[PDB]
């Protein structure tokens, strides 16, 4: 014992648990969730079937109304309108819209993709060429619906719904220590270590860390990219928020007024999420430690301007990972392993099935012990099994899935960059 | 109840769930260490628990069993191993005998509601329920055994039952749980900024998990089997508040005696072998047979071996020497021939089972042990040890008593006679009294009175001068003023 | 060996309780269901 | 089944009724066996789609039968302990105190001082009780029945019924042979992750036939098979004494088996030390150095068969056999040797030396004696005497089932009394007994003397400090009724 | 002469059988093997009777 | 199954154990060609052996 100076080891980082996702404790593997989709057009399950309700699409304002009697001409690239008539178009976003023509004009003959057509139509709308319109059906038509008085081809529009579902499956993970007797004995003689228990700790720890890290990555993987579309400033850099570029800060200088610009965008992204999910404004953010340092140093309340030290929210990743609540509104977590600099926002409801992302544990941290008689060295390890999944409707773009059944597990096709509950923001310039 | 696990116990689950929620509602917060004084093992869970269903409970048990209760099981077996010996079991007998008194034409442990309650009707209902608990346990005949086991293993447990078809009147006979099979825990259902100090209803559940697949003792063909998670409300239990330096690994009073119990056993056996060994004669022959292979030398060795061997035994069934007729020669004539030229062949004797004692250490240790078993030194009038044991026993009774208070409130509350709030305010005093040995009680009281009489007698000549008779009754006879008036009034009646 | 086996991660087979090994399943637990909110 | 063993048909019906009652009970959600002592339970788990009871069957069959074998070893030992001194008396004294019986005294007797349907029943019950004792020949052999219960740890009897008119043709009991009956309990039920059911257990017993001769064990065999018989057919009772765990029931003398054997071993050791080497002891050597065995053997004989003595003790008459007179002044020995070397000589050996100081043997003997569950006053009244009285009472109380069982059996069959009534009555229908009245009277007298002494001292203060009513209830320990009665009796005597 | 059999089974399966049918089925495997062996013996005895 | 209903057991305390038996025979030669037992059930006793 030549003046032993004690010893060191690394600390274990904390986790965000499942604070921002579903937890679905399971008592069996492979559970299932189903859903009802209000639908109309006399066949709940069909190509082209239309959903009665959707966060991103307007309703068919003339479905029970005049559209019952007549079809409306569709808008299409290169066609010319007739003043006073009404044209129909289903937009990629904002859905069914009926537009009365105030003028006789053409629409972007050079348009190709629907996105280009939608853009010109939007311009014609702004221009006052095309105006939103709806009306009920002339009563003289309604009078004979269902073939009265010798009439024909006059059914009422019908509605119903389609129930379908998705299922999940649990994947697992296991690790062993495979250690030796002699090492454990020496450790007992050096620090008084058990050298099995420490390993048990390490293995269990690693498993838990991986799972939690996996959830965060799935959040990032499925989240839509923000500062885009409906939340985009047209002169911006598309998905990334800077401090070195006046476009994102409305010309700000003077950090006391500049930093608030981010808070503004955060609200916009949180609101759009509600627009995407139909449930509510995002209520949680996870972000790089650099982002949080900024948040904690700016007065996030409404005031003239203000700057100081980063004391507003815990900023460490050594005690916790939970920084605090932003404005008293969003739960702020720190992405202690962020690859660059950024921040994801999202919404999780009181209903465990209302989360977008779900974790559903079935088996966890089962210890295993024994020894191999060939050399009698010990073997120890741990096993976990759970499975994760995604919300039906998380994509939101589609009103319904193929074949009335799908995996509820994430995949590229199922959710990469699609999840209505979360949005990504890249951050630079801090 | 997230899942209806073991629906068999749903009524108990309801009771625990109710209590858990009521505890959460109450501000049982701002507490640094888990609010656990004594009893079952502690374990921590995450904020919002994140540690369910029962499979998580099994994680708790493994961690709490592998390095934990497995030791507890050894201790239970140890107490039995301790009691299996004499000079041990009798201490227990003395304790049990003093702890529960059984006498003819009198009562047994009984509920005594002599302090304020809502009404005599309620009191009568409580007294009937108490009686049924005893009836369920056949306590008046088997109470000694119930107590003995409690004391010896430092813990008693009984499974409670609800119908459940008409659960209102659901308590029926209690069932003792098999020792070593069940672990109890209290989980901290909370987490904050590194070190929660807030409310948790702590679960208060337990798991049974033994198997005869691995024996502590053979001849057993039944056990708990797999891991069965049952709510605390389901059971009745008690133990002494005796634990090790850490954890909740409960021990008994008799633990203190384990050391000397074995030191004595060890010395007793050592003494026996010390004296038994070498009691017979003992001799080694050395034969000078060289220049021969064993196949030849063996003949010469047998020549001597089958001639010099006194092929007899002592018949310990009947004190005789086998084939020794007549009973004893006046001499045993032996002979040997030598082959070399020197007196080397011979037979040595070994020293024999002589007596070197001074057999006193064993006595010292036995005395230390007897004392260690929690006994008076008056054993192999009224004195301090007897008074001390009366106190030891009332504490053992006081703790043991929960065995009745628990099923008593349980069935009273289940039926609805009293409410939970009332129970908590009422006790305080819902005490259960144990009978006291009338023989010795009379003797104690008689000596007290004799002293009181003698002091009164001494005071007598000064009563009309310095010590009023009221005062003498108050200080010498230790009477209250009401008692003094009562005696004066009764005397007036006697005189008429 | 008495392997229970697994699912093919094919939603059909999962729903039907079909596995690759010795034991088939009763079917998935119901975790609940979804209806959408009605616009205000 | 067809009840091939028609022998117990009426008993089978009694068990069926009790079994059915258990099936109708709400004793469910029970993980515990709900058992304390007696018959050996095991997991004969059935009436469920797993059939694990088959393992239970095979276990009992394949392993036949360490339960009863151990029981035999224990009982055989118990008898062998009783065979020695002190143990013999300890048992006798205990048995005698448990059942005291003398000229014109009271026998164990059913005391029906608690509420009953009718005094007519009280008399019927007492008359049946007397017949139970007559069946047991209690007044002649009650001591033997108890002794076996105490010593062998258990007592049991076969009940005998008609069977034509089984509720009428009720006959005396046949005391069964210890070591021949296995008592069992079968868990014939199962549920989710193991039984949590009533587990009626049947609690029947199995009789092993045996016909030992002079074998003193089942030397060649006992007698093949055993018969499974309904519990209603057997009267039994046992001590509250077991091994560390299980239904491994032991006798009262079991606790003493350790020191019992240590003492015997020590005592045998004392004797062997003391007798061994008592005679003179000496080996003659002969120098036959450098001789072949062919010659050495005779040269050895030239001393060995010539210097050999001729004396043995006559233990019938204390004489030295054929030695007259009794002793010479000297034993003349001589020897010639080939050289001036101590080779051809005689070397004597150690004799039967004294050792004890028989204090160790005593330490163990004393520990053992007390280990026999006896007072240290044996080889006025103290705490130990009171303790023994309680002990004896308890022993009699557990034993008591030996009367209560055949009593209810016969009373219930006659019906006389119903099962419901029996169950309500007991509770308490305690059988009291004659105790050694010599000592009881002495106890009562000493208590009274003390009460008198206290009153005597109190006397000067009765009219000022301690009233009569108080003195009588506190000092002389009289009841209120007793006090009034004593006053009334005096008023009569005074006239 | 001797007899012997093995269970050779999946732990994962046992975990699920408990969840699926309330069966851990390890006890069941033990019971099966035990049952089969004692059954095999019973028949063996009968056949030796038949053979002899 | 019929477990042992019609058979003996004589359980072991040693693997591969042994059993013995004794026959009463006549003519003063325990082992001989033509030797006969005193009491074989299928053969009458030699009434003349002890007689004429």
Residue numbers in the entry:
A (entry chain e): 92 to 521
B (entry chain P): 1 to 380, 395 to 510
C (entry chain d): 66 to 105
D (entry chain O): 2 to 380, 395 to 510
E (entry chain D): 262 to 313
F (entry chain D): 106 to 157
Task: Give sentences copied directly from the paper behind this entry.
The viral portal vertex consists of a 12-fold-symmetric dodecameric portal complex inserted into a 5-fold-symmetric capsid vertex, making it the unique vertex of an icosahedral viral capsid. Eleven vertices of the capsid are occupied by pentamers of gp24*24, whereas the unique twelfth vertex, the portal vertex to which the packaging motor or tail are attached, is occupied by the dodecameric portal protein, gp20. Early genetic studies showed that the portal dodecamer nucleates head assembly by interacting with the major capsid protein gp23 and the major scaffolding core protein gp22. Here, we report a high-resolution in situ structure of a symmetry-mismatched viral portal vertex from bacteriophage T4, which illuminates the key interactions at the interface of the 5-fold capsid and 12-fold portal.
